[PDB]
Design an enzyme around this catalytic site. Structure first.
Site: not given
Ligand SMILES: NC(=O)c1ccc[n+]([C@@H]2O[C@H](COP(=O)([O-])OP(=O)(O)OC[C@H]3O[C@@H](n4cnc5c(N)ncnc54)[C@H](OP(=O)(O)O)[C@@H]3O)[C@@H](O)[C@H]2O)c1
Length: 319
Positions: A12, A158
């Site tokens: 999600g 990370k």
């Molecule tokens: N957005 C960027 O700029 C960016 C750049 C590089 C890498 N990333 C990586 O992309 C991935 C996705 O992040 P995003 O940007 O899309 O952020 P996000 O919308 O906050 O997505 C992160 C998700 O991980 C979950 N999560 C956190 N802790 C958890 C746990 N203990 N058990 C199960 N689920 C858990 C969340 O669930 P809940 O909502 O229930 O907390 C949330 O759905 C991550 O690995 C992030 O480090 C993002």
């Protein structure tokens, strides 16, 4: 690709929601993990094309290994995207590092074909020694002590999670590929505003009063999702992949925003011009380009981010 089953962890979330959307469009059966399937914040996933027949929301947590076994059982592939996104090490570190080991181990027991892990530019860039003129690419790794000493705990988490993924995959004989996105922008499918998008929202709300003298790389969320899929599907894919479209100065970012959205209190003043304006650093996204990925220009991406924020109630037009 029909009959193929894949797990997306943290389905999600911002990036994952787009990944699930596109996987379903491509004909995959998807087992998306979320902490609570009945939580309304996940409702957008149910409404995706193909979700009724082919998306199962599996209740799981990264620190509940059995829940991951149940989700991953019977999957051909796993997209491990779930992570805290926070500089609070008490929140960040265990779900990142232990969670990632847990996912790789569950995937090994399920005999999955491949795992794709979402790392970050934070695991690539944050090295004090690296010469400023060196091209940033997949051979570059961040310095952990440096991340630790500068309280960049998100980058630390990370990086260590990525290192744990390679180590565990090697030990368990799992085919692992890693993607390293830079800051991701684009339209939001989910109801809330995730961390990366807050970096744009603050300009449109005017909570940001100035823009810093700094540069960083940007990429569109749809490209990031497509890239995850491309890495899963391409048999020859190997190692890490930097996923980035261009590098912009914050000044360039606010200029783009203010031209598109002149009604909003976007800052025009640089925080500190004591030093010369920072120039974009050099990077290579050639690995992904060589697999056929085309990158959406950042301007379009920034525009769509704001339109999405407006649609979803976060940016009424000022009076
Ligand atoms: N957005 C960027 O700029 C960016 C750049 C590089 C890498 N990333 C990586 O992309 C991935 C996705 O992040 P995003 O940007 O899309 O952020 P996000 O919308 O906050 O997505 C992160 C998700 O991980 C979950 N999560 C956190 N802790 C958890 C746990 N203990 N058990 C199960 N689920 C858990 C969340 O669930 P809940 O909502 O229930 O907390 C949330 O759905 C991550 O690995 C992030 O480090 C993002």
């Amino acid at each position: 690709v029909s009959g193929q089953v894949v797990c997306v962890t943290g389905a999600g979330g911002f990036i994952a929601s787009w990944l699930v959307k596109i996987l379903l469009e491509k004909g995959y059966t998807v087992r998306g993990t979320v902490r609570n399937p009945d939580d309304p914040k996940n409702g957008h996933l149910r409404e995706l094309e193909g979700a009724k027949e082919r998306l199962t929301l599996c209740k799981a947590d990264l620190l509940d290994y059995q829940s991951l076994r149940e989700a991953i059982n019977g999957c051909d592939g796993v997209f491990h995207t779930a992570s805290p996104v926070t500089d609070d090490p008490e929140q960040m570190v265990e779900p990142a590092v232990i969670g990632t080991k847990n996912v790789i181990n569950a995937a090994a027991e399920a005999n999955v074909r491949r795992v794709v892990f979402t790392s970050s530019i934070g695991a690539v860039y944050m090295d004090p020694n690296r010469d400023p003129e060196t091209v940033v690419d997949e051979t570059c790794w961040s310095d952990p002590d440096f991340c630790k000493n500068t309280k960049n705990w998100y980058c630390y988490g990370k990086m260590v999670a990525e290192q744990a993924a390679w180590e565990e995959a090697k030990e368990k004989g799992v085919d692992l590929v890693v993607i390293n996105p830079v800051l991701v922008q684009g339209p939001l499918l989910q109801t809330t505003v995730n961390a990366s998008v807050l970096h744009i929202l603050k300009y449109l709300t005017g909570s940001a009063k100035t823009y810093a003298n700094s540069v960083q790389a940007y990429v569109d969320v749809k490209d990031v999702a497509l890239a995850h899929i491309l890495l899963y599907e391409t048999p020859e894919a190997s190692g890490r992949y930097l996923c980035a479209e261009s590098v912009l100065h914050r000044g360039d970012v606010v200029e783009i925003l203010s031209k598109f959205f002149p009604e909003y209190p976007i800052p025009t003043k640089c925080s500190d011009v004591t030093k010369p304006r920072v120039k974009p650093y050099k990077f290579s996204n050639q690995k992904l380009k060589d697999l056929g990925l085309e990158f959406t220009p950042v301007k379009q991406c920034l525009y769509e981010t704001v339109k999405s924020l407006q649609e979803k109630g976060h940016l009424p037009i000022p009076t």
